[PDB]
C-alpha cells in the first residue's frame, strides 16, 4: 500500500526526530591537511590521508603512466576477463611489502570483509567478534551460517572464557579491527594470537587503520606485533586511507588467495579496478620504501597533538594511534562542536549513532604526516576556545 | 587449521568441477587483445561502447587526476565528498532524466545500500527468480518478506500481488537486462501492474545502462518510466561506462535517504578523481557520439543473424549479450577451449550457473567490434560447430 517519496519521507523524519540526520559538507580543494570547505581555507583533521599521499605528485605520476598505457577500465570481473598484468604486479608488490606468502586486491575494504569472511566460514564454525568491530565486518558475518559470539572490547579474559565454552571439528575464528575506527585503540594482538594458538583458532585482523600507520614502514598491526608469517593469522585492510586510493587486500597463505579467487562473492560478481587506481597504489608502496621518514613524522604529530588536548583537559579515550577522538555523548552536541570548530577554520566532523554507539557521539580528529605544527597549533587554539564556550574546560 | 580449511575447500571445489583458474590479459580492454600470449577477438568483456580504452575518457581522467589527486581520503558523509562527485551526480541525473542520482562503490554494493535503506521488517519483495546474485545479498541483509515470481511471468506476479499486502511497502525487484540470456524485463507490463496494486518497481540495469534507450539512458528510460517517483533504478558504471562504481537514480528524496541510511555509502571511501573524470568523460562522449549506441546494435544484429544462418540457437536474446546454445555443459566448455584455439575468446557457461540441458557460450558484442573481427568469430564458430557436429 505504501509509495516511494512517502516511505523516504517517513524515514528521514524518524532520523531527524532521533537527532541523527546528517548534512555532509562538500570539499572544494584536493584532499590535503589544509583544504577548502564552504569557501574558507580550513585545517583538515577529518580525512584518513594518514601519509599525505591523497594528492602527492609521485602517486599521481604512476597513475598517469598506467592510465595512458592501459585505459579507464578493466571491462570485467577478475575471474572472466578483468585480470590484467597490472593487478598481478600490484598483488606481487603487496605480498613482498607485507612479508606474506600472497596478497589479493578486492574492490573495497568493505567488500573484502564480505568476500574473505564468506569464503572462509561454513555452518558449524564459531566466530568471536570484538563488540566494537567496524560495520563492514558485521555485514560480512551476517551473510555466513557461522555461530556469532561477541566478546567485550579488547577483553582477552572474556575471550579466553568463550574459547573454553565453544569448540568445533571445524574452524574457530577470532575477528577484530586492528586499530578501532572511532576509539583509536590497538587490538591486544600480543595476547590474542598466543590465546588463539592455545585453542586451535585462527585470528582475522581488519587493519583499515593499521595499514600504512603501525609497524616497520607501516607494514601494519600484525607486522608490528611480529605475527606476519603465522599461517593462522589472516589480515584484510583497505587501500583507501593511508595508501590514499581505493580497494582492500587479503594477505596470508598462498592457498588463501586461490580460495578467495574461487569463493569470494564480491571478487566473482564485481569489476576489478582500473589502471589509474592500481598505478597510484604501486606508486604508494614505492614511495613509503623511499620515504620511511613520513611514518615517523605521523607519530611525532600524533604525540604532540594528544599531549596538548590532555594539557587543556580533553579526554582522548586512551587512544594510541593518530586517531584522536573527543567524546560529546549525544549527537546534537557533537554536530554543534563541529559547527563551532569550523567557525574557527578547523574541520572535524561530528559522528553519530548508526556509525558510533547511541549516547557515545564524538568528533574524530585524524593527525597525518602532512600536518605542520602551525596547523596542529591552530586546531588546539580552536579546541581551547570551543571547549571554553561549552564549559568542558 | 587455516591451511587445513583452505585445502579441504579447494579439494571439494575441484571434485565438483567448480574450481576456476582466471586467464591474465596482457593488453588493454579492447575488442582485440592478448590472452596467454595470443592475439584474440575478445567477446568476454562488458566494454559495450568501446570506452574502456578510449582517449577521450583517458584525457578527462588525466585532467581530474592532475587537478585533484589519487584519492578522496574518506567516506562521502565525513570528508570524502568533493566538487567532482557533485558534478558527476548532477550530470548523471540530467542524462538519466531522474530527479536525482547517487554514486556508490559498486553496482554490487548499490543493491545492498538502496535495498537496505528502503526495506523494513513488514515490507514484501517480489523478485524475478533469475535476479543477479548482487540482489540476493542485498535482500538477505533486510528484514523484508521475500517472495519469488517465475522469470518475466506477469501472470504469476499479479497472482502474488493479490495474495500478499502491507500497510508498508511492496517492492517488485528485477534485473533490467538479465545477465545470462540477455532478455529484457517486461517493464511495459510490470509497471502498469505495479500501479494497479500500490507497489514500487526496482530495476537493476547493470546491462541496460549504456545499452538500451535513447543514447543508452537505460531500460527504465526506454519504456518511458524515468520520471515516475515509484520506479527506482540501480546500475553499475563498470560495464558500458567502462570505469567502476554504481548509481542509484530516482526521486530527489531517495538521494537524501541513501546519504543517511545506505551502509556502503557510510562505510566505504568515495572514488578518486581519475574514475570520476573518466565517467564525466563517458557521459560527455555518448552525447557527442550517439552513433556508438547505433553501431553496438548493428553489430549485435549482424552477429546474431549469422549465428542463425549457421543454425545456432541464440535463445531469443534481445541485447548485445549473445548466448549460443551447446546443450550439455561439457560440450559448452569444450567449444570455449576450441574457440580460443582459433583466436576467439568467449566464456562457456554450464549447469550450476544455467539449467542442465541449456549450457552455452556468452558472447558480448560491442560498438568497438569491426566486421573483420565479427567475421573471424563466426568463421571460428562455424568451424568449432562443424567439428563438434551441432551444425550443418
Ligand atoms: C554487473 C552487475 C552487477 C555488479 O556491478 P559491479 O560494478 O561489477 O559491482 C550487479 N548487478 C547486475 C545485474 C550486474 O549485471
Ligand atoms: C574504512 C574502513 C573500512 C572500509 O574501507 P573501504 O575500503 O573504504 O570500504 C573497513 N574496516 C575498517 C576498520 C575501516 O576503517
Residue numbers in the entry:
A (entry chain D): 3 to 395
B (entry chain A): 5 to 396
Give the article text.
We report a chemo-biocatalytic cascade for the synthesis of substituted pyrroles, driven by the action of an irreversible, thermostable, pyridoxal 5′-phosphate (PLP)-dependent, C–C bond-forming biocatalyst (ThAOS). The ThAOS catalyzes the Claisen-like condensation between various amino acids and acyl-CoA substrates to generate a range of α-aminoketones.
We predict that Arg366 is involved in similar functions in ThAOS, allowing the biocatalyst to accept the observed broad range of AAs. The acceptance of acyl-CoA substrates ranging from C2–C8 is more difficult to understand since there is a lack of high-resolution structures of bacterial AOS:acyl-CoA complexes.
